[PDB]
Design a protein around this ligand. Structure first.
Ligand SMILES: Cc1c(F)cccc1CN1CCC[C@@H](Cc2nc(-c3ccc(NC(=O)c4ccc(Cl)cc4)cc3)no2)C1
Ligand SMILES: [Zn+2]
Length: 295
């Protein structure tokens, strides 16, 4: 009747080491980076849209709006300096998906985060769908130029409080995050159309599944595909206030969805431990953290 022998983390681990679990898709959000020191810029405890009074924005979201940025880029870049992370050290959760890659299990990681930590942890561009873009690369905004700049160039401009301009054409250079007024990357839709024909397990980590169209990804899985949520709070259930592919963890009809409630790092650690990967994961994290700490 069902691919999981029980609706628990133990059931997921046994399935993961069975011949049927070949291809894993990860869907990740801000909750996998809060333990790296990166705030969830959508939680209120952060208060992003505060102290923006001096910029005289026609509305708070203008600082992330493409049309405003191209006319007045100085507020966005002042904010980017104010909130620039002190370090880019990926979490146990990020290195868990590097292990998935190493073991040939990672089909794709779809991320809502812009903080580059998936790449630092060793996921390659082919492994990634950065649904909201990334700060890792930046581009000249002129359509006839589009010169690409790395984060180290963009960092120097941001901290020196020099508005970044293209060396070839002197247009603005923008970090590759999807501003309001921009479309999600086409790669998001083309990869979704192919990847979800092939997926054996959906690993949903550190996302409340409230932002669309990212949240709708869970409904693209085949009906048999198990879905494991590792998150501080249960998420993804159908919303009774809207009257369908949502998460069913707890009903007598539940058959494939599992919720592990806690910190993402601790959940990934628990899953790795069940899989026999705990020493591999600790060795990788300790080595990569030491290398980053020594930069
Ligand atoms: C962290 C970091 C980092 F890693 C590396 C360097 C610096 C920073 C600091 N960092 C620099 C960016 C601004 C701020 C974090 C932040 N970015 C946002 C944000 C960005 C994009 C969107 N776009 C959408 O949601 C969207 C758009 C179009 C469509 Cl169709 C659908 C959705 C919304 C909010 N909010 O806060 C501080
Ligand atoms: Zn240019």
């Amino acid at each position: 009747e069902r691919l999981l022998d029980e609706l628990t983390l133990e059931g997921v681990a046994r399935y993961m080491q069975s011949e049927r679990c070949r291809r894993v898709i990860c869907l990740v959000g801000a909750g996998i980076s809060t333990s790296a020191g990166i705030p969830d810029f959508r939680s209120p405890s952060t208060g992003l849209y505060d102290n923006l009074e001096k910029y005289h924005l026609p509305y708070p979201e203008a600082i992330f709006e493409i049309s405003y940025f191209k006319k007045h880029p100085e507020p966005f870049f002042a904010l980017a300096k104010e909130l620039y992370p002190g370090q880019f050290k990926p979490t146990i959760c990020h290195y868990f998906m590097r292990l998935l890659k190493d073991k040939g299990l990672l089909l794709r990681c779809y991320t809502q985060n812009i903080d580059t930590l998936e790449r630092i942890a060793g996921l390659e561009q082919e492994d990634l769908v950065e649904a909201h873009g990334t700060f890792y690369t930046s581009h000249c905004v002129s359509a006839s130029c589009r010169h690409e700049y790395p984060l180290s160039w963009m960092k120097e401009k941001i901290f020196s409080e020099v508005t970044p301009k293209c060396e070839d054409c002197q247009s603005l250079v923008k970090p590759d995050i999807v501003f309001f007024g921009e479309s999600l990357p086409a790669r998001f839709f083309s990869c979704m159309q192919s990847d979800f024909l092939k997926v054996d397990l959906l690993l949903v980590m550190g996302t409340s599944l409230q932002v669309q169209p990212f949240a709708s990804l869970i409904s693209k899985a085949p009906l048999s595909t198990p879905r494991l949520l590792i998150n501080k709070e249960k998420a993804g259930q159908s919303d009774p206030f809207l009257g369908g592919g949502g998460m069913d963890f707890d009903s007598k009809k539940a058959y494939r969805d599992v919720a592990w409630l806690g910190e993402c790092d601790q959940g990934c650690l628990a899953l790795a431990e069940l899989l026999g990967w705990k020493k591999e994961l600790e060795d990788l994290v300790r080595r990569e953290h030491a290398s980053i700490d020594a930069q």
